[PDB]
Write a protein that binds this ligand. Structure first.
Ligand SMILES: Nc1nc2c(ncn2[C@@H]2O[C@H](COP(=O)(O)OP(=O)(O)NP(=O)(O)O)[C@@H](O)[C@H]2O)c(=O)[nH]1
Lengths: 104, 113, 50, 308
């Protein structure tokens, strides 16, 4: 249906758009500031290419932005008990304050 | 294997004419495409030599919309009616692909010469 | 007001792009050159054309 | 066995040396744009039924000109015979050649396309729009086969960058003439087929790099004068390449020829609302959507974006 709605139809189909947007928020939850991003994406899907891992990002930037996002400035964390490696130039640490654990 | 289109849809019957409210009661062969956003008529096929305007009411009844037809597209169909010089039409505003499905199905599962 | 009024009259209804008014009706050119090898090509001799 | 080669060489240039392994097909790895009732997409599949032969010039050195002969069923054979014999007149059609040949005990029908190119346009568009510097071989082969660059240029590290090494712009700018010629031949094919009354959908995996077309296996016929090219995938996929290889630069010349000085436009001209229409009519004739140059007349935001 994505191919159908992309290269065959002519006007927007709200039902399919809502379906795809629900799918995206289910497997590609985002948090966005002004060009600095952090993504918590599913792993078993991205491993078999159903959500863009990193190389789709590289290709998209290469063909639609006329730059080359070299894979030396793109972190990747395989664990979650420690937060994102770097967002807005603030490393994130999990600490025990009061009686529970919070991120600082 | 880029295909023209599978699983197309089929025809309805509606009135047509050449100017404004020329709808006698019903003179055409409209082709439906029942989209979920409403029934979408696609093409026309009348034995009248030219027509310009056709009008099919909506699902409400009070809303009847006039439609504007193509220039002639002429060919003959071999059917139980024997020789049948028909004249086929579409609705303006129609992209190439809709002509695609209409002509593809008509030439795939209907007879013409 | 001589050259400008002369050239505007040549337009269809007196409308011309702005990027050409200093290209024809300016009486003082200023050229900035980074290095000698680049100076060689453009500002050769005591007079040049551009 | 060996008579197959001499039979493949119909009436031209018996200088063929098979790249396969005899009278059997060879498996290749190309791109496709498939959508038939089950699976759609645009990716790199695995073609299997292609006996590929290569033509070489004198001194017996290889040269880019191939013979892609394909084996398939009987209905496809007669359907293609009819459609091709209907469309033989057009200059922008690879010269097909049909025969029936026996392998073991079966009178298997053959189709023998002639004088094609190694990499069809779908491969160029894909390998440029899915870049990955760890695995880019088709792009290198395409770039070095067409005299754009030479293989010594690929040793200068950071050769694919757009920030450093900005000479990659000039390197890519050597495919513009090929792309423009391909577009013009597509227009010619569309006109010819619309005249000859055929209906179908064009694809990027048919038009090889020279410009020739083939594969009429999906088209169907109608009464002459009422044909229609379904062209949305074609241009909608070729679009991001048209301003990366600069195929429109051949128009800023006095006669559409790269051996002549630039046209001297009058400075006072600013409207320019006719050359755009002429270019859009000559190159994008069958693109099925109104294009209004002055974006003021646009109906709503979507049309504004589409015309911009
Ligand atoms: N011309 C050519 N095509 C090649 C070569 N290697 C692989 N191919 C691919 O093999 C195919 C040859 O054309 P053809 O099989 O008739 O195209 P098709 O769209 O698959 N045919 P159909 O629609 O009937 O299934 C194309 O998809 C082309 O990209 C090559 O060296 N030359």
């Amino acid at each position: 249906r994505l191919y159908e709605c992309l290269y065959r139809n002519r006007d927007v189909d709200t039902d399919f758009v809502n379906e795809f947007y629900a799918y995206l928020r289910k497997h590609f939850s985002m948090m966005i500031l002004s060009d600095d991003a952090v993504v918590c994406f599913n792993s078993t899907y991205a491993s078999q290419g159903l959500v863009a891992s990193i190389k789709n990002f590289k290709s998209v930037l290469y063909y639609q932005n006329n730059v080359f996002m070299s894979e030396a400035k793109c972190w990747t964390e395989t664990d979650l008990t420690k937060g994102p490696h770097e967002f807005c130039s603030q490393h994130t640490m999990l600490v025990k304050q009061g009686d529970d654990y919070v991120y600082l | 294997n880029n295909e023209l289109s599978p699983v197309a849809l089929r025809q309805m019957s509606c009135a047509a004419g050449t100017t404004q409210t020329a709808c006698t009661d019903d003179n055409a062969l409209a082709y439906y495409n029942t989209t979920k956003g409403g029934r979408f008529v696609l093409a026309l096929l009348s034995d009248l030599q030219d027509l310009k305007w056709a009008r099919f009411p909506k699902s409400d009844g009070t809303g009847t919309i006039y439609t504007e037809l193509e220039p002639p597209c002429r060919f003959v169909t071999d059917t139980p009616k024997g020789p049948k010089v028909k004249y086929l039409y579409f609705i303006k505003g129609l992209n190439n692909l809709n002509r695609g499905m209409v002509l593809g199905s008509l030439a795939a599962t209907v007879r013409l010469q | 007001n001589d050259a400008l009024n002369n050239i505007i009259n040549n337009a269809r209804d007196g409308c011309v792009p702005l990027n050409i008014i200093p290209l024809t009706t300016a009486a003082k050119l200023m050229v900035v050159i980074p290095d000698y090898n680049t100076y060689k090509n453009t500002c050769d001799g005591t007079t040049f054309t551009y | 066995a060996q008579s197959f080669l001499n039979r493949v060489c119909g009436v031209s240039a018996a200088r063929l040396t098979p790249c396969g392994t005899g009278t059997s097909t060879d498996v290749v790895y190309r791109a496709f744009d498939i959508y038939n009732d089950k699976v759609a997409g645009f990716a790199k599949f695995l073609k299997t039924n292609c006996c590929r032969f290569q033509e070489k010039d004198e001194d017996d050195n290889l040269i880019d000109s191939y013979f892609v002969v394909k084996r398939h069923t009987f209905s496809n054979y007669q359907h293609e015979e009819t459609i091709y014999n209907l469309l033989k007149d057009c200059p922008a059609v690879a010269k097909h050649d049909f025969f029936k040949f026996r392998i073991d005990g079966d009178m298997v029908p053959h189709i023998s396309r002639q004088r094609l190119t190694k990499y069809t346009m779908a491969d160029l568009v894909y390998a440029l729009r899915h870049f990955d510097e760890g695995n880019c071989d088709t792009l290198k082969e395409i770039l070095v086969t067409y005299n754009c660059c030479d293989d010594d240029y690929f040793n200068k590290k950071d050769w694919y960058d757009f920030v450093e090494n900005p000479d990659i712009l000039r390197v890519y700018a050597n495919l513009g003439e090929r792309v423009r010629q391909a577009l013009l031949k597509t227009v010619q094919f569309c006109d010819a087929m619309r005249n000859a009354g055929i209906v179908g959908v064009l694809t990027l995996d048919n038009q090889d790099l020279n410009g020739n077309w083939y594969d009429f296996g999906d088209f169907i016929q109608t009464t002459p004068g009422s044909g229609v090219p379904v062209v949305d995938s074609y241009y909608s996929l070729l679009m991001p390449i048209l301003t990366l290889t600069r195929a429109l630069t051949a128009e800023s010349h006095v006669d559409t020829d790269l051996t002549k000085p630039y046209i001297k436009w009058d400075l006072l001209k600013y409207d320019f609302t006719e050359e755009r229409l002429k270019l859009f009519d000559r190159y994008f004739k069958y693109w099925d959507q109104t294009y209004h140059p002055n974006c003021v007349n646009c109906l709503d935001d979507r049309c504004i974006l589409h015309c911009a």
